[PDB]
Design an enzyme around this catalytic site. Structure first.
Site, short mmCIF file in Angstrom:
data_model
loop_
_atom_site.label_atom_id
_atom_site.label_comp_id
_atom_site.label_asym_id
_atom_site.label_seq_id
_atom_site.Cartn_x
_atom_site.Cartn_y
_atom_site.Cartn_z
N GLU A 118 3.60 4.44 14.58
CA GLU A 118 3.77 4.94 13.22
C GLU A 118 2.42 5.16 12.54
O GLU A 118 1.54 4.30 12.60
CB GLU A 118 4.63 3.96 12.41
CG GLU A 118 4.73 4.27 10.92
CD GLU A 118 5.35 3.12 10.13
OE1 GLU A 118 6.17 2.37 10.71
OE2 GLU A 118 5.02 2.95 8.93
N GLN B 197 -1.61 -2.41 11.35
CA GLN B 197 -0.93 -3.28 10.40
C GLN B 197 0.18 -4.08 11.08
O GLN B 197 0.28 -5.29 10.92
CB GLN B 197 -0.38 -2.44 9.25
CG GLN B 197 -0.15 -3.23 7.97
CD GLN B 197 0.40 -2.37 6.84
OE1 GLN B 197 1.45 -1.73 6.98
NE2 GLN B 197 -0.31 -2.34 5.72
N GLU B 198 1.01 -3.41 11.87
CA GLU B 198 2.17 -4.06 12.46
C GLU B 198 2.25 -3.87 13.96
O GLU B 198 1.93 -2.79 14.49
CB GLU B 198 3.45 -3.52 11.81
CG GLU B 198 3.43 -3.61 10.30
CD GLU B 198 4.55 -2.83 9.64
OE1 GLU B 198 5.36 -2.20 10.35
OE2 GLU B 198 4.62 -2.86 8.39
N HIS C 121 -4.56 -7.53 5.62
CA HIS C 121 -4.31 -8.92 5.27
C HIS C 121 -4.70 -9.90 6.38
O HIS C 121 -5.25 -10.97 6.09
CB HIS C 121 -2.85 -9.10 4.87
CG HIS C 121 -2.46 -8.31 3.66
ND1 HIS C 121 -1.19 -7.82 3.45
CD2 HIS C 121 -3.19 -7.92 2.58
CE1 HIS C 121 -1.15 -7.17 2.31
NE2 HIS C 121 -2.35 -7.21 1.76
N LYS D 97 12.06 5.75 3.71
CA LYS D 97 11.98 4.75 2.65
C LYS D 97 12.56 5.34 1.38
O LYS D 97 11.97 6.22 0.77
CB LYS D 97 10.53 4.34 2.42
CG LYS D 97 9.92 3.53 3.54
CD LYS D 97 8.45 3.25 3.26
CE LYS D 97 7.89 2.24 4.26
NZ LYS D 97 6.40 2.23 4.30
N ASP E 172 5.12 8.17 8.31
CA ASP E 172 5.52 7.35 7.17
C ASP E 172 4.88 7.93 5.90
O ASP E 172 5.50 8.70 5.17
CB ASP E 172 5.13 5.89 7.40
CG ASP E 172 5.29 5.02 6.16
OD1 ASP E 172 6.05 5.39 5.25
OD2 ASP E 172 4.64 3.95 6.11
N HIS F 76 12.51 -0.81 5.45
CA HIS F 76 12.33 -1.66 4.27
C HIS F 76 11.00 -1.34 3.58
O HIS F 76 10.32 -0.39 3.95
CB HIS F 76 12.35 -3.14 4.68
CG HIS F 76 11.33 -3.51 5.71
ND1 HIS F 76 10.31 -2.66 6.09
CD2 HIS F 76 11.17 -4.64 6.45
CE1 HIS F 76 9.57 -3.25 7.01
NE2 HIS F 76 10.07 -4.45 7.25
N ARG F 77 10.65 -2.11 2.56
CA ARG F 77 9.30 -2.09 2.02
C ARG F 77 8.75 -3.49 2.17
O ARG F 77 9.48 -4.40 2.52
CB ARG F 77 9.28 -1.66 0.55
CG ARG F 77 9.87 -0.29 0.28
CD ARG F 77 9.25 0.80 1.14
NE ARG F 77 7.81 0.97 0.95
CZ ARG F 77 7.24 1.84 0.11
NH1 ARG F 77 7.98 2.64 -0.64
NH2 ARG F 77 5.92 1.91 0.02
N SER F 78 7.46 -3.68 1.93
CA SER F 78 6.90 -5.02 2.05
C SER F 78 7.46 -5.91 0.93
O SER F 78 7.70 -7.10 1.13
CB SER F 78 5.37 -5.00 2.06
OG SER F 78 4.84 -4.07 1.14
N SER G 144 0.85 -1.18 0.00
CA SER G 144 0.00 0.00 0.00
C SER G 144 0.89 1.23 0.00
O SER G 144 1.52 1.55 1.00
CB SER G 144 -0.93 0.00 1.22
OG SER G 144 -0.21 -0.13 2.43
N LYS H 174 13.74 -0.18 10.76
CA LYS H 174 12.58 -1.05 10.68
C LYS H 174 12.76 -1.94 9.46
O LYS H 174 12.52 -1.51 8.33
CB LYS H 174 11.29 -0.23 10.55
CG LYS H 174 10.01 -1.07 10.50
CD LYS H 174 8.75 -0.21 10.41
CE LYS H 174 8.10 -0.31 9.04
NZ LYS H 174 6.75 0.32 9.01
N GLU I 192 6.44 -9.77 5.61
CA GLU I 192 7.61 -9.29 6.34
C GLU I 192 8.09 -10.28 7.39
O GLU I 192 8.90 -9.94 8.26
CB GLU I 192 7.32 -7.92 6.95
CG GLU I 192 7.18 -6.84 5.88
CD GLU I 192 6.89 -5.47 6.43
OE1 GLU I 192 6.90 -5.30 7.67
OE2 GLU I 192 6.65 -4.55 5.62
N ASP J 161 2.76 0.00 13.88
CA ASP J 161 2.52 0.73 12.63
C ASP J 161 1.02 0.62 12.37
O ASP J 161 0.54 -0.40 11.87
CB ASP J 161 3.30 0.16 11.46
CG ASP J 161 2.97 0.85 10.14
OD1 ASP J 161 2.28 1.89 10.17
OD2 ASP J 161 3.41 0.36 9.08
#
Length: 436
Positions: free
Chosen positions: A293, A164-165, A156, A345, A320, A373-375, A43, A396, A206, A244
């Protein structure tokens, strides 16, 4: 003439999700070589630099990068071959100018970044110095305190969880090597705990779990159990927790409210920005939470201000999608006292130069820069070197499974090993934005 770039070549490759991305190879006259692979977000923030996809639904569902690759080989290459490999800024600027658009939508941010990174790695190779040294100069020493995406919620996950995280952060470890071990041990203890509960121990993009928890509290409480199970404290002297929220993902763009029913099923909270702050605050009060985040939506400036007022002295608040690694947006967050941290990022902005400008602007406002990172990742580990190059203090880069994550942790192990006694680890003191 040894340091002159003689070749710049891109090819299509796959990221850690099996989707196309690209890498670039740069060679100098002397034969020095660098390869730059590009990550991809799932996303993406509304305001990110443009990642160029082919859109051909007969190849890779339209996710091909052959257009970006062509752009590198047929446009960028001609413009950059001939530069000294060491003229990073000049080269990044030339690519920005060559593209001519603010969001890098002509050549593609992925085309440009691939070259940007490949050139830097070629230069480090040419000078026969580590990448963190080439990038940062002589005063590189801080291994970053990692925040590790151990549990997943949001889109997800099928659990009733909006965020999300959920991350753990070994702020109490003496070295990065030990902090890494702490994280891994807790990760493995979590897995065991999930098996015993009959929950799924397969992993997301991840490398963390997305188990069917009862909800947010159950998830957090499960993490604390894993921490204790592994024999560690939960707090500043041990392991702390972070979110996050990725709130842009459940922020009803029309009602401009934070709609939890989206992920936590109907009958779940729908919060105004104010109520959103209260919720986060309740959680910070309840648990050993050190960082949050995107608690507010990428464009909820008012909400960010309030949140920063309420929690910014107690808790790190990371922009972010709020800042998209872009000094234009960060400069405003700073002026308006929104957030006290930025997630960095590289492919959100598209050059190492602009990335490093964002990191420096952040520091000078008292904000931390968390290199991310990115996913969709690759075997590249450049962000490990960026984290140390700038003594950012935080990173991260994922859970403790999947080489797309572990490759960065490994690279940080090498860097710590090469730094020897010079190596530092700041743990809780990484948060100079909280006056630790």
């Amino acid at each position: 003439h040894m340091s002159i770039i003689t070749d710049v070549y891109a090819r299509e490759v796959l990221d850690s999700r099996g989707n196309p991305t690209l890498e670039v190879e740069v060679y100098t006259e002397s034969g020095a070589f660098g390869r730059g692979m590009v990550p991809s977000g799932a996303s993406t923030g509304e305001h990110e630099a443009v990642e160029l996809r082919d859109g051909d639904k007969s190849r890779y569902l339209g996710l091909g990068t052959q257009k970006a690759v062509d752009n590198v080989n047929n446009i960028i290459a001609k413009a950059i071959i001939g530069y000294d490999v060491r003229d990073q800024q000049a080269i990044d600027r030339a690519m920005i100018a060559l593209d001519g658009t603010p969001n890098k939508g002509k050549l593609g941010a992925n085309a440009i970044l691939g070259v940007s990174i490949a050139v830097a790695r070629a230069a480090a190779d040419y000078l026969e110095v580590p990448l963190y040294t080439y990038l940062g100069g002589f005063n590189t020493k801080v291994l970053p305190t990692p925040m590790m995406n151990i549990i997943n919620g949001g889109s997800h996950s099928d659990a009733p969880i909006a965020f999300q995280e959920f991350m753990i952060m070994p702020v109490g470890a003496p070295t990065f090597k030990e902090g890494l071990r702490w994280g891994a041990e807790v990760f493995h203890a979590l897995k065991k705990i999930l098996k015993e509960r009959g929950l799924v121990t397969a992993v997301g993009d991840e490398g963390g779990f997305a188990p069917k928890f009862e909800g947010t509290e159950d998830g957090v409480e499960t993490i604390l159990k894993a921490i204790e199970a592994a024999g560690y404290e939960a707090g500043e002297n041990g392991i702390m927790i972070g979110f996050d929220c990725a709130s842009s993902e459940f922020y009803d763009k029309e009602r401009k409210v934070y709609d939890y029913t989206k992920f936590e099923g109907e009958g779940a909270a729908v919060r105004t920005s104010a109520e959103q702050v209260d919720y986060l605050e309740e959680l910070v009060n309840k648990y050993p939470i050190i960082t949050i985040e995107d608690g507010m939506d990428e464009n909820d400036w008012d909400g960010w201000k309030v949140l920063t007022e309420r929690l910014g002295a107690r808790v790190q608040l990371v922009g972010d999608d709020f800042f998209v690694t872009n000094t234009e947006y960060l400069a405003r967050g700073i002026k308006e006292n929104a957030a006290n941290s930025i997630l960095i990022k590289v492919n959100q902005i598209g050059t190492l130069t602009e990335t490093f400008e964002a990191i420096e602007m952040a520091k000078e406002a008292g904000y931390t820069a968390v290199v991310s990172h990115r996913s969709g990742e690759t075997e590249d580990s450049t962000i490990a070197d960026i984290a140390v190059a700038t003594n950012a203090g935080q990173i991260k880069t994922g859970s403790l499974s999947r080489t797309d994550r572990i490759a960065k942790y490994n690279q940080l192990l090498r860097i710590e090993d090469q730094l020897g006694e010079v190596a530092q680890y700041k743990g809780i003191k990484s948060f100079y934005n909280l006056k630790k």
